[PDB]
Amino acid sequence: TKPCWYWDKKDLAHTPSQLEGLDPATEARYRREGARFIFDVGTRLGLHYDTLATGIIYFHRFYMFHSFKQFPRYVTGACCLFLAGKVEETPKKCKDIIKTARSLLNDVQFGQFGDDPKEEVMVLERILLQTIKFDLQVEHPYQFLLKYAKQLKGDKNKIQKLVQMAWTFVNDSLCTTLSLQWEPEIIAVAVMYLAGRLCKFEIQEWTSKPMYRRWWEQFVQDVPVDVLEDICHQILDLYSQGKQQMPH
Amino acid sequence: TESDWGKRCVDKFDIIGIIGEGTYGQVYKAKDKDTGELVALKKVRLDNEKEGFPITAIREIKILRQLIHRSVVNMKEIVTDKQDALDFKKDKGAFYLVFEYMDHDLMGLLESGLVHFSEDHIKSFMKQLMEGLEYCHKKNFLHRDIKCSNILLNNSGQIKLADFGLARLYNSEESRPYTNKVITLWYRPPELLLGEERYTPAIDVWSCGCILGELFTKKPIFQANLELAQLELISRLCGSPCPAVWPDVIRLPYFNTMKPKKQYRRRLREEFSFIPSAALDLLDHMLTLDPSKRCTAEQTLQSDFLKDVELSKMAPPDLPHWQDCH
Amino acid sequence: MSYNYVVTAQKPTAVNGCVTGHFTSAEDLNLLIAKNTRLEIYVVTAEGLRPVKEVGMYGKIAVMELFRPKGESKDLLFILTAKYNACILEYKQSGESIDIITRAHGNVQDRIGRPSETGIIGIIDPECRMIGLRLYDGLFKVIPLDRDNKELKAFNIRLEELHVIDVKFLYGCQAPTICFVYQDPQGRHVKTYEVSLREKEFNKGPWKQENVEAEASMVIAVPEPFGGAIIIGQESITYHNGDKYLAIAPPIIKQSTIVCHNRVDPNGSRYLLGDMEGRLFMLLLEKEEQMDGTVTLKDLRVELLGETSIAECLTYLDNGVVFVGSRLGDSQLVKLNVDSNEQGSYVVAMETFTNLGPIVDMCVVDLERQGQGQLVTCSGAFKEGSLRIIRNGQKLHIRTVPLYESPRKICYQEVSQCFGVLSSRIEVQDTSGGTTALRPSASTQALSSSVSSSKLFSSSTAPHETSFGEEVEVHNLLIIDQHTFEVLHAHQFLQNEYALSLVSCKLGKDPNTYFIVGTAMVYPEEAEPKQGRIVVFQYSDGKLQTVAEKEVKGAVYSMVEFNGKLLASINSTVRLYEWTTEKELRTECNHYNNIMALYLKTKGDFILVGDLMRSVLLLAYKPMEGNFEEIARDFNPNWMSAVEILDDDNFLGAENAFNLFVCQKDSAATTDEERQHLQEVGLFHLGEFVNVFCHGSLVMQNLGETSTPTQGSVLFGTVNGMIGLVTSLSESWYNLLLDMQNRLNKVIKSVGKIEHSFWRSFHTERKTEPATGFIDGDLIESFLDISRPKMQEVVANLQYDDGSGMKREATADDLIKVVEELTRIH
Ligand SMILES: CC[C@H](CO)Nc1nc(NCCCCCc2cccc3ccccc23)c2ncn(C(C)C)c2n1
């Protein structure tokens, strides 16, 4: 019926990129750069946050089936965003995506697009669709962050601080393979959990079950804290590796 | 696995003929060699590369893999032409969307004059359609192209909805800007004739009501070539758009521009007096001018006409067979 | 775009209605006979009919009635066309000048309505206060006959009874009253309502009765001496007036359905009744006068008079002369005698008026080698079945070959100097368990005969029950000689086997010329036949020899010879067979993308297929590959009745809605879709139902010289007997004639003031389109009959292009030459 789009962390040691001699750090770096390229390009073009995420999810899934050494990432990124735009009904012309890419990429990087940038991107659409197995509908942590936050009742300002902090964590998790490890519902809960821990908030009090200390189980059944803690640990890793710190 | 679409080749189908062409594109009737099942293949051409893969197809793929209902057509898989080896840039082969083969389409059945509908056949027909529309509307999807050519009927009497090329998501809380003209002129709702652009799911209900009437007359209710003449025909029957019956008609862009010859009174019940009482009520509520007063899909199912229709007793339409040949 | 020309060679011959009254003068008794689109006016004499006038109308005549409103000296004529064009007409004569006046006119079509099953019904009040029309289920339309209603404006009264069988205005009522039989789930009933012009609604009726026969068919409004109504059924005739109820159920009428009625005596004492087997009855009303001074109906009686042609309409005229207007056989004038003849009959034929009747099929063959052509048509039905040899000589010469059974398909086999005809005769289940024919017919009177002994279906295992009295069709193949039309041989097909297709041809390397018949096993239980045969016969030495049989899984609707191979359509499948050296058929290729492959035509390696609902498809045999290819299909949905190939790119079709269209291959190879899309380049409302398209012409063309502007010749036969012709034009010639039509339409006065452009507009219940690509030749040939002032008015500013001069003014005498050349094509 529908394809399975989630892998185990241990499996990422065996992506095509890894097996062609790319080391783990480099593929992770390529994923951040490709995702952030997609994010920056679409943000300049005024695209809805779902459209950016869909392209990023297409991108992340793509490089589970192909190697970064044979498919230049910024071309792939641009193609994903182009398709994402048509999928999410925020369409853009390919020539406009290319124009924005030239602004944000240096000459060496834009070298990936070859002699005819538009062609290299449009040609890839055939491969992208086959690669993502024509499963175009994608759900993102954002809708669950809001669906769940809406059922919280309490201090308006504390809950809005929780949401925005978690929302930032969602935007940051797009640079990682979490999109490939856990369903979005879990991500939304995980980022709420991390925002709560950092804000010294106790979310159970805002739920309809204030004495149910595992507050998330009434949103997402069957999630052990182990999963939530792993997701949080990985999100905070990005902040510690970089120079940026937790938003608070 | 069954889910790995886009890889299997169209070699797996024996093409029987070309069933259809037009805005939807080229559709071929085929039989799968391995299963022996009759299918319908829509050729999607990305060779133009003006916008790459058509958005009409992207919506139909996106929506019909999410919608599962007896009265919604099923896309079984997507298959491809023999592709060029190790030359993805050179390759221009087209993709084919596999559907189930529906024996007939309502337009073909009506235009050829070969069908007759009793009240009970119309009950079985409308119940399925409005149940299907209900499934889609409850999922916040608007068909936006309900016409007789897009309703498919098997000889079994099963009804399935089809061309989702123009379908888009609807936000129940927030108004979104949409394409001004979406439905065929004969089946276009009055709000879209006046250019609402923020249309509700009620646009699809109006279209089905035009079909409900058409099934009792065998002739479309409102046939016009120009948007003004269509509003005139609707007005002669349903009444002219009035601030009294349509409070927000003044907000519609072309309200002052597009005026009917007169401020007509509603004559729907009089001109359709030959329709059964239970159905005439359904027509009057589905052909309501005000989008907010127009009934929902669910409300039609909880009507005297369709509520107590047992869907097990399909009752197929009067198919012509040899009797009409002779 | 394509350009074609359509003309009538023989006008509609079938009688669709007949009334008598005082239309031409308040003094003469006239007989008005209606043929499709044609009105004939006669005056009744002591020897027969004197013709006085004939007009054409731009419409199929659906209702025809004579009425005389207070203040008029003579009867006026009401006519309603099948496209809902209404008008009131008057006869006016000024010495030698006869014309028809349009007194009132308008189109009464409703924007919304369901057309009724029993068709348009039109009746007029005895006081001529209003015209009643039953056009749509659930509605009664009233046109009030006031002096001011020159536009025939009308209103609708809601009618609760949705399914109405028949209605009449009753006699003797205080207000206008209707009597109608209706059918609802409880059976058919007879009811009365009253009609109020002031209130514009129905009021309670004089009497309400129910429980009339389940198959009650016709309503008779009995005149004032008796009052009330008579109801004719399948088994019983009943009279209803108020409380009075009389019913006669004589066994004689059960045998055959009664279809027509007419009043003999104006008091209502006697009526004529006719039935489908051609019998003519007298219905007699027996008067009983009470000492009160009142007359009441005592009893009903039915007496058999004799035999007539299977009659669509009857008219009593005067003396003992009755006019038998026939749609299936020859129309007639018969005299009723008081004394029976020695055979027991009171009916003696006077005159026989030719009716080409239903033309089921036809072939064009030059029998006498006159380099001209003759048309041998399969015409008539049941006891009226005939073969009509038609040759052009200024009138057409028609020889009739009575068959007394239904003809279905005809083909010519020159090698054998004979014709093959497929026939159907009706037999009835009798007490022996078998069946008995109602009369001898061609199949029973053949010199030599044979019966299929095939064992293909002999395995049966399928039980079918028989009830005494039920009809069954027996299909035969008839071998008929071309010099003497004596039926030489009759081959009877299997029980429940229908012969659907016949071809005469040689196949493969086989030098013998065969008759090949395609059949279908027809059982009442089956919606679509699932068994069938292709049978190869040889006619040799006065005997038909069965050569080979091929079983198929369906009905062989159509067959055609194809480059020595046999092309046959079995239900959805289109198949090509080869003829082996072992004298057996072997399949080569198949096409399955059809609903029902009703019609087939070929040219070279191209095949045109006609479908029940999917218009027309062009197939091609790829000899390199040994299979079929879909060249182009017409995607617009149409219900086909016949198809024909005009040339390699143009294809002609006929719709069941009485319309003609021409499809053209786009021949523009920019995209695959454009090639596969057949474009409906021609649209034309003919007004006739076309059963057969045949290439050929009846014109004397022994040597070719002076060929006309028209190129190509296709003849077509219709249900109403009309034989027509379709030919092609060059672009310039079409535009000249088209520009001229628009000029003639402004000049020529139409009966009923019906717009010619409206009449020829393509029309189904769901669409109306302006005609395109077709020249109404019958309009063009009317230029010769219009007065000189009108001719010169037509030719003003007329310029023909593409000629020696880019623009050349035409004179009237120039055109009279052009139209005369066009008249020679038929
Ligand atoms: C044209 C667009 C529509 C989209 O709805 N064609 C369509 N007709 C589906 N059945 C109907 C089959 C009807 C009969 C088929 C046929 C056979 C031979 C000749 C014909 C000539 C004219 C018309 C029909 C003909 C159907 N079943 C699934 N699909 C998907 C591709 C949506 C379908 N599309």
Author numbering:
A (entry chain C): 20 to 267
B (entry chain B): 715 to 1040
C (entry chain A): 1 to 393, 708 to 1140
Paper text:
Recently, several unexpectedly diverse compounds were reported to deplete cyclin K by linking CDK12–cyclin K to the DDB1–CUL4–RBX1 E3 ligase. Here, to investigate how chemically dissimilar small molecules trigger cyclin K degradation, we evaluated 91 candidate degraders in structural, biophysical and cellular studies and reveal all compounds acquire glue activity via simultaneous CDK12 binding and engagement of DDB1 interfacial residues, in particular Arg928. Crystallographic dissection of 28 ternary complexes demonstrated that despite considerable diversity of the molecular glues, the overall complex architecture is highly similar. The low-affinity DDB1–CDK12 interaction primes the complex, while the ligand, through filling the kinase pocket and bridging over to DDB1, drives robust association, offering a rationale for the unusually broad chemical diversity observed.
Further modifications of an otherwise robust recruiter DS11, including extension, shortening or rigidification of the alkyl chain, or introduction of larger π-systems all negatively impacted activity, underscoring the importance of correct arene positioning and identifying steric constraints for bulky compounds that lack conformational plasticity (see also Supplementary Note for a more detailed discussion of the underlying SAR). In summary, exploration of CR8 SAR around the R1 position demonstrated that surprisingly diverse gluing moieties (arenes and heteroarenes of varying size, but also aliphatic groups—albeit weakly) can engage the Arg928 side chain and therefore facilitate DDB1–CDK12 interactions.
